[PDB]
Design an enzyme around this catalytic site. Structure first.
Site, PDB file in Angstrom:
ATOM      1  N   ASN B 186     -13.744  -4.815  -2.451  1.00 30.60           N
ATOM      2  CA  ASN B 186     -12.515  -4.538  -3.234  1.00 30.60           C
ATOM      3  C   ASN B 186     -11.219  -4.790  -2.418  1.00 30.60           C
ATOM      4  OD1 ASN B 186     -14.298  -1.503  -4.118  1.00 30.60           O
ATOM      5  ND2 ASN B 186     -14.416  -3.474  -5.158  1.00 30.60           N
ATOM      6  N   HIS B 188     -10.348  -3.333   0.375  1.00 33.57           N
ATOM      7  CA  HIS B 188      -9.914  -2.076   0.966  1.00 33.57           C
ATOM      8  C   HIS B 188     -10.596  -1.919   2.343  1.00 33.57           C
ATOM      9  CE1 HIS B 188      -7.887  -0.061  -2.386  1.00 33.57           C
ATOM     10  NE2 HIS B 188      -8.631  -0.852  -3.155  1.00 33.57           N
ATOM     11  N   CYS B 223      -5.541   2.999   5.370  1.00 36.76           N
ATOM     12  CA  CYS B 223      -4.822   2.032   6.177  1.00 36.76           C
ATOM     13  C   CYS B 223      -4.891   0.747   5.319  1.00 36.76           C
ATOM     14  CB  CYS B 223      -5.483   1.824   7.536  1.00 36.76           C
ATOM     15  SG  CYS B 223      -4.883   0.358   8.427  1.00 36.76           S
TER      16      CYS B 223
END
Ligand SMILES: NC(=O)c1cccc2[nH]ccc12
Ligand SMILES: NC(=O)c1cccc2[nH]ccc12
Lengths: 265, 265
Positions: B186, B188, B223
């Site tokens: 995704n 991330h 982050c």
């Protein structure tokens, strides 16, 4: 995994893991390169190698070092798919050894990729290359096929093409790249696959989103140490083609050079 | 892997890979954490997910990790088979919990255990919310009805509150940045990357003389791909104990806090 019937090659199956895939839900080229090294280690283990040097390499403090990796992927294995990889080794006179791999779809038996690597011998302490010893080569000729078996048989194929040195200014760059503990191998050296990831850090986002990586050739010149910092440089040379250079952040000492080839999605 | 007889838990076996081990030739805690997420993903796949319910996808709701707690007695050696059993349980409207038990496949002895706390968040607004009745009823059928805890102890370490590290930190690793290998499908940053980043600030001397036994990590904020992280560590203590803080470079916004416990080799 197991050695094939004739004992001259090794096969292993891998189920693609969830954390091993990219945004298109197919395995990354770093996951493929990790699987190439894993089936390479299982092949050496099955034939009696160190747990991967010989009896005489160990006493002389000699090791195998990768000089070049060339990977070509037609179809990346999807998350949950099984990929079967067959690998084998072949000597190349005193210059070194070569290890080739063939990647297949387990269900269809179709070849979805291939790879070749060139290895050289180095004294682990002095880091000096020394060709291959007379009785060191005799210790492993019994585990390699005697007739040539090439993953890239084409005369003057992409796996043997010389790579030029990128000239500044680079078109794209990713600077201040540093390894972490996850990037180290069991000998506290940076894993060969980490360099592939670092080359690809400087490929612009737009390319990654519109193109698929088909070919990567990487020359290995010098190792990045745990306290070294790397700059990844990339320039378009064209399908889309790129020239790559990894160098240490300060003095600009080269650690790797390579090319990539990409197909539009 | 497969769901157990009663369909309320999932088991999977993994052969430890060559590139998955540290200098001690046993699997790293990041390899363990990757295997916990992989068997978690196969459990959700086996019960019909894809890993949210029909109502979560409609409401743009997702699962977010709030806390990970791992305790390892023996790390699996390279080539060993480790069997992991996982299950889920609802904790009212707070969220859900996923626990794991790690075993030696040959001896059947428990070599580790882990617990995780998950919360529900709107994927777009990043806003937390309690679990609703209709979302909860959808997955309560795949969780055991009687409590099954990996950490049953009266006042176990998995529920202990972690303080915030005060500057000056004793040890620090500055300018940590994710690369493409650190992203999930995704785009991330993978939850395991944060574990590796916490451990970057543990001094070399500790890693060489001690073995990591326990790690508890709170997750507060992500982050992003263009963020830069500083990893801070301070000794709080045979055993060695540490307090950890991950924060973004610049403003110093907290992304994680945790503690580690280490035993002398
Ligand atoms: N992996 C190795 O060290 C190796 C070197 C030369 C020939 C070989 N055949 C099987 C493994 C192997
Ligand atoms: N992994 C999940 O999405 C999940 C969430 C809640 C209960 C569950 N039971 C099995 C899987 C699962």
């Amino acid at each position: 995994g197991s050695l094939t019937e004739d004992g001259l090659s090794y096969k292993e199956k891998f189920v693609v893991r969830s954390y091993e895939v990219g945004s298109n839900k197919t395995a990354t080229v770093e996951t493929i390169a990790n699987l190439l090294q894993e089936v390479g280690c299982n092949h050496a283990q099955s034939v009696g190698f160190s747990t991967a040097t010989t009896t005489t390499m160990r006493k002389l403090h000699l090791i195998w070092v990768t000089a070049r990796m060339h990977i070509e992927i037609y179809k990346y294995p999807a998350w949950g798919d099984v990929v079967e990889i067959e690998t084998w080794c072949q000597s190349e006179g005193r210059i070194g050894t070569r290890r080739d791999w063939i990647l297949k779809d387990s269900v269809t038996g179709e070849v979805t990729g291939r790879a070749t690597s060139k290895w050289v011998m180095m004294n682990q302490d002095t880091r000096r290359l020394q060709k291959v010893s007379d009785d060191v080569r005799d210790e492993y000729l019994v585990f390699c096929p005697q007739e040539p078996r090439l993953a890239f048989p084409e005369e003057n194929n992409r796996s043997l093409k010389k790579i030029p040195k990128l000239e500044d200014p680079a078109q794209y760059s990713m600077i201040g790249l540093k390894p972490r503990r996850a990037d180290l191998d069991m000998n506290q050296h940076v894993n060969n696959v980490t360099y592939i990831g670092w080359v690809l850090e400087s490929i612009p986002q737009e390319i990654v989103d519109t193109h698929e990586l088909q070919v990567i050739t990487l020359d290995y010149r010098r190792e990045c140490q745990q306290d070294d910092v790397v700059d990844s440089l990339t320039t378009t040379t064209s399908d889309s083609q790129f020239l790559h250079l990894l160098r240490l952040s300060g003095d600009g000492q080269e650690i790797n050079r390579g090319t990539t080839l990409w197909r539009k999605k």
